[PDB]
Design an enzyme around this catalytic site. Structure first.
Site, mmCIF file in Angstrom:
data_model
loop_
_atom_site.group_PDB
_atom_site.id
_atom_site.type_symbol
_atom_site.label_atom_id
_atom_site.label_comp_id
_atom_site.label_asym_id
_atom_site.label_seq_id
_atom_site.Cartn_x
_atom_site.Cartn_y
_atom_site.Cartn_z
ATOM 1 C CB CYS A 129 -0.941 0.057 1.195
ATOM 2 S SG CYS A 129 -1.835 -1.455 1.591
ATOM 3 C CG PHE A 131 -7.663 -5.510 0.272
ATOM 4 C CD1 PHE A 131 -7.004 -4.329 0.603
ATOM 5 C CD2 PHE A 131 -7.077 -6.719 0.639
ATOM 6 C CE1 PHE A 131 -5.820 -4.347 1.320
ATOM 7 C CE2 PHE A 131 -5.887 -6.741 1.354
ATOM 8 C CZ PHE A 131 -5.258 -5.553 1.699
ATOM 9 C CG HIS A 183 -2.818 4.105 2.221
ATOM 10 N ND1 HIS A 183 -3.514 3.647 1.119
ATOM 11 C CD2 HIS A 183 -2.670 3.043 3.047
ATOM 12 C CE1 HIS A 183 -3.779 2.362 1.278
ATOM 13 N NE2 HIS A 183 -3.275 1.971 2.438
ATOM 14 C CG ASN A 240 -6.654 -0.458 1.691
ATOM 15 O OD1 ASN A 240 -5.987 -0.235 0.678
ATOM 16 N ND2 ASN A 240 -6.100 -0.665 2.883
#
Ligand SMILES: CC(C)(COP(=O)(O)OP(=O)(O)OC[C@H]1O[C@@H](n2cnc3c(N)ncnc32)[C@H](O)[C@@H]1OP(=O)(O)O)[C@@H](O)C(=O)NCCC(=O)NCCS
Lengths: 383, 383
Positions: free
Chosen positions: A157, A208, A296, A329
């Protein structure tokens, strides 16, 4: 100097994002997921998965893995049956195809000609191939065959920050260079059936999603054609102390498997201020609340603890939470959406800069290492 | 400029190589290989494999896969039984371990402190992991946690040229930057039993060996403390026309599976002059026979046809043939050995430069794409 260097700082000259069309509501995901994997009788496990979804901060995600695709590839729906080849058959086309979708938008905003792209920097966590997604993207877009490529497979990531760091040096060291910085992610390499003995599986299955973003980066913008959105002034990274083993990821016969043996939100919160204090200095060390925050969105816990440790006002993390909410994400691609969302919020609220009124801001990624990646940007005026 | 740039061209300041200790003589390899895979009954196939070995231009190769290791990991001796997990157990440790051995030599020759390394650029073709081999190498060597990393997993044979190209921009754009450029390869991810269904495999089984090279790269060498061996002046690349599929590689449940087409020498030889004619120009277009030739020894057919097409004198390709002879094709690492060998030949023969008397030279890689990678170097005087 046989290849002449550029003069000014690297600039973000255009932004594009893309997602697969199918949407999955988080409130409905536990039924769909446990059914499609034939685990619907595991009531206690499904309740745990629901708890995770409810704490996730995610409203919906986009995924290429629809009911049709999953029924057509039952191996992906198992727990640990060997499936890496059916996984690569999906991601080898979708990852560059999604990147091309985003790249067209970024080039449109930039305003330049595709034949003036000189470089590609590409990150992903979603499988590997030879030749790589960089090569495919070049073909799909019809770029010149002499494009210069940097293919960063298997980043995790922090890769979105990585592509902007590499693009900086490539743009700054080559007169006239125009870089496509690309991050593209598709969840088919990591998807798998839920299991009582794989709690990190449970979390990934809740967090995800798919997406891609690309920026055009270049120094010395031509005033009659190009309009800079952000300047890149500093880029660095560090490994956090005593973080060995925090995030491990092994590509196996059954795809990508994660193991998290340390408190990742705690590790970042305890350490972020010391490093951010260094990054501030080359731009005059503004206060935390005089800066914008493209962070992030690895999860809600990390956003919360960084907000508290740094005593940020609630609007600072809104860009990140919007993206978490609407896209989840998307691994390396996520932070690219965040900066875009901060620009959009700026325009919608009539702020004086594209960083919601602030002049300087952070562009932050993190992942295995435990690695922290940080760039410092300056926001354009909002005219 | 908030991070100040460097002034001069990027320089190779030290070189190191490493190989696993076990040696495999090519004239006996068909017996060993067909023995250990229990394929001795495939007599026709073995005769073909021997014909390949005899035409390969290889005298010996170094490999981690000894008899004991192969006996202990029988999955690797199969054709297509799932084996990626035990393969990754080998290369995830050996690939960075081998790099660390070559990096120590390069650092000793450079003379600087390890704490002054600022960057790692790392290429490999031998499996993947999170965190990556770059992170493992930083740990093994005890580098600063703020080292900046670029991990190009899954490059194929052009990756040695790639790391030097990336190192160039990183060193030239950052005052004081000292880069470790690394390429490391271990054949445990690609090795498999010979088969009448995978004739491409036969050629790979005859060509590939293990090895690693690392260069210290930096601009602005401190006089009387650092001694530059080569200057980097130009770096570019191109995709050759109509060469999709010439070289393919997919990572699967059974490890890495390559496809190699019969056209590869022809595709390269028929196109190389046209491109090299362009790369020549920023240094005044020296004549082919006034240059040195650090060329990736992908095979003898490639070296032979390039020598013929360009009408080179027989000494130009000797460095590449020495490496082919003693180590085989070590994928991305091979070209790093070739340049080192050209320096050693220069010293041994008392030439006036470290490029066998020539001033400028090519550093050339190729691989999946089909991608052609080229740098133009200047050799130091031989004092
Ligand atoms: C492999 C190589 C040494 C063969 O030697 P050569 O001097 O060309 O001799 P030949 O043409 O007689 O080749 C020997 C055998 O290999 C076979 N062969 C060569 N290339 C092959 C390929 N890509 N796939 C399958 N078989 C191949 C030939 O058909 C021949 O088989 P045969 O004895 O039954 O006729 C040479 O062709 C070479 O260097 N090729 C390039 C290697 C390469 O692609 N690099 C690796 C990655 S860049």
């Amino acid at each position: 100097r046989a290849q002449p260097r550029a003069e000014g700082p690297a600039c973000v000259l255009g932004i594009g994002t893309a997602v697969p069309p199918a949407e999955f509501l988080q409130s409905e995901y536990p039924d769909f997921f446990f059914n499609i994997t034939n685990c619907g009788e595991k009531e206690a496990l499904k309740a745990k998965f629901k708890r995770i979804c409810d704490k996730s901060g995610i409203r919906k995600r986009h995924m290429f893995l629809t009911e049709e695709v999953l029924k057509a590839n039952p191996g992906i729906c198992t727990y640990m049956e060997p499936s890496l080849n059916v996984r690569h058959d999906i991601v080898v086309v979708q990852v560059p195809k999604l990147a091309a979708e985003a790249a067209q938008k970024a080039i449109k905003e930039w305003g330049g000609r595709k034949s003036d792209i000189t470089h590609i920097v590409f990150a992903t966590t979603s499988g590997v191939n030879m030749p790589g997604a960089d090569h495919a993207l070049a073909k799909l877009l019809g770029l010149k065959p002499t494009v210069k490529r940097v293919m960063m497979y298997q980043t995790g990531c922090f890769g979105g920050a990585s592509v902007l760091r590499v693009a900086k040096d490539l743009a700054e060291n080559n007169k006239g260079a125009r870089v496509l910085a690309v991050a593209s992610e598709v969840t088919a390499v990591t998807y798998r059936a839920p299991s009582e003995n794989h709690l990190d599986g449970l979390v990934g299955s809740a967090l995800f999603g798919d997406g891609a973003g690309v920026y055009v980066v270049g120094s010395d913008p031509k005033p009659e054609v190009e309009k800079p959105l952000f300047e890149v002034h500093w880029a660095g990274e560090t490994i956090l102390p005593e973080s060995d083993g925090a995030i491990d990821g092994h590509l196996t016969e059954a795809g990508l498997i994660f193991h998290l043996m340390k408190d990742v939100p705690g590790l970042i919160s305890k350490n972020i201020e010391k490093f951010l204090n260094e990054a501030r200095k080359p731009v005059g060390s503004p206060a935390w609340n005089e800066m914008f925050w493209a962070v992030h969105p690895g999860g809600p816990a990390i956003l919360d603890q960084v907000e508290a440790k740094l005593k940020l006002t609630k609007d600072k993390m809104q860009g990140s939470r919007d993206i978490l909410s609407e896209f989840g994400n998307m691994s390396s691609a996520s932070v690219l959406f965040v900066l875009d969302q901060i620009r959009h919020r700026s325009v919608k609220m009539g702020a004086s800069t594209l960083g919601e009124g602030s002049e300087f801001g952070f562009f932050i990624g993190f992942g295995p290492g435990l690695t922290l990646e940080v760039l410092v940007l300056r926001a354009a005026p909002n005219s």
